[PDB]
Amino acid sequence: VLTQPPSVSAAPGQKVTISCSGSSSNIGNNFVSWYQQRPGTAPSLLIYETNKRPSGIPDRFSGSKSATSATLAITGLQTGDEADYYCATWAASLTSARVFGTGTKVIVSGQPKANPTVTLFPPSSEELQANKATLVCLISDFYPGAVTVAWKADSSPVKAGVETTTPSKQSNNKYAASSYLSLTPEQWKSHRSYSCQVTHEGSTVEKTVAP
């Protein structure tokens, strides 16, 4: 299970760093492939065999590798570099392990950031009697539009029941997204509180509700 940073961002010019990670079984013994995927278009090979770059790819895109990690790097950023960046490994030959990384969205924007205004709502009395539960965390007015919602119940994190929409531009050129934590009434009455952690540009904002 190779994991990568959810989001990355930088103004045009400065250098960027993206890193994979995992056991030596799927890192050390093997090589590292990198792939770029611009929005609304198919992926493309950026780097294979850890370092070597195919033709058409500038010398800016430098690869790397270590004991239990592997780092991609982009020196001078253009508006075009703005894309999704996945890493991959294939050997030896394989196990029940994964194949591609979780992803890493690179946003190229020198424009000033705008923190998200998180709004959390608890389920309705009407809904609980309909034998269901739903927590609605609404995220609005943010930029460069890179979020990563995370739900928690009494400190402990939650995994199942989450559905998070993709960011979307508003009228004011700022982004907005919504995340729902669908639940059962029995789960909802089991914990003291439920939290909604929105991770945007490092800084995290946590709202919380209770019955």
Binding site: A42, L45, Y48, F100, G103, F121, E126, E163
Partner: protein, 238 residues
């Protein structure tokens, strides 16, 4: 190099479907081939792989015994038999090509005798590098059809304050929402709907109004789902 996928569409969970990938502009019989799906909008996931001769077959555990990759070098076509589908299999499937030109080194010299032919002992094998991609073909597996939205109230939180109403479990789009019979367009924010694991849609529309007018002014969420001919006027209370 040019790859073109086809065969995708909308099929209920359980029923089958077959995806084809028409290879062109390269020596098909030499390179390995892969299938890579991508749920919108989430990460990539390799499905299955196959070598030049078809002797090697690879699959992900989540598709262990419900998907089988195969090829026809005579027609330069790559085939993926998708039967016993799940909703989680819903994704855009990319046809990928392996970078390493495969070649055989050791032959058995035991059987048959042409008798075509002799398989390879130590071929170069797939490298796992997806150099050339297609635009992909979409596969939609959903146990859903036309259904009306279950509207529910929302709380008063503090813009100062912020009210709304939840549009739950409906299909298909569009669903329009207004407030107080279109009298109140203002401090309104209608978020985008969702794509549930069960393939049903659900949106939310928050509204930020004077906290002083709450006890006095009453706000009524007007929902509308024309496909199901359903209209709803939900009155939101603190």
């Amino acid at each position: 190099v040019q790859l073109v996928e086809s065969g995708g569409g909308v099929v209920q969970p359980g029923k089958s479907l077959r995806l084809s990938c028409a290879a062109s502009q390269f020596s098909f019989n030499r390179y390995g081939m892969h299938w890579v799906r991508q749920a919108p909008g989430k990460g990539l996931e390799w499905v299955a792989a196959i070598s030049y001769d078809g002797t090697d077959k690879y699959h992900a555990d989540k598709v262990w015994g419900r998907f089988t990759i195969s090829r026809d070098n005579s027609k330069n076509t790559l085939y993926l038999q998708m039967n016993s589908l799940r909703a989680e299999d819903t994704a855009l499937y990319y046809c990928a090509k392996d970078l390493r030109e495969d070649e055989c080194e050791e032959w058995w010299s035991d059987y048959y005798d042409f008798g075509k032919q002799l398989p390879c002992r130590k071929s170069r094998g797939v490298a796992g590098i997806f150099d050339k991609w297609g635009q992909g073909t979409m596969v939609i597996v959903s146990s859903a059809s036309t259904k009306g939205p279950s509207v529910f109230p929302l709380a008063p939180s503090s813009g100062t304050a912020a009210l709304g109403c939840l549009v739950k479990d409906y299909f298909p789009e569009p669903v329009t929402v207004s407030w107080n019979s279109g009298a109140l367009t203002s401090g309104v924010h209608t978020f985008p709907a969702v794509l549930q694991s069960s393939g049903l849609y659900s949106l939310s529309s928050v509204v930020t109004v004077p906290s002083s007018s709450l006890g006095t002014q009453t706000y009524i969420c007007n929902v509308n789902h024309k496909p199901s001919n359903t209209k709803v006027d939900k009155r939101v209370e603190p």
